[PDB]
């Protein structure tokens, strides 16, 4: 997982907020599933009672 | 030639995009041209065979 975290300061000035108030965080990953062996995979559907 | 590149990462960071995915290069330069003496410049205009 990447983590990219920019805090208030020099960092966050800019054009738009020139006294660099605010700031955030933001995490991000890949994933992807490989099935080998579908064969070996079963599965029964019921309903459930309260 | 002045030259400026910013690859994708923490440095591309920002608030409207907080993940960081763009990136982008530049180049500019100033020209200019003084003619003193206009007369020692010539110029035949013809048309030229396929």
Do not use: C, H, Q
């Not at 020139?18 to 995490?27: A, K, L, Q, R, V």
């Not at 992807?32 to 070996?40: A, F, N, S, T, Y």
């Amino acid at each position: 997982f990447t983590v990219m975290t920019k805090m208030p300061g020099k960092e966050t000035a800019d054009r738009n907020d020139p006294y660099g108030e605010t700031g955030f965080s933001s995490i991000k990953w890949y994933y992807g599933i490989l099935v080998k062996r579908p064969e070996r995979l079963a599965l029964i559907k019921t309903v459930a009672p309260l």
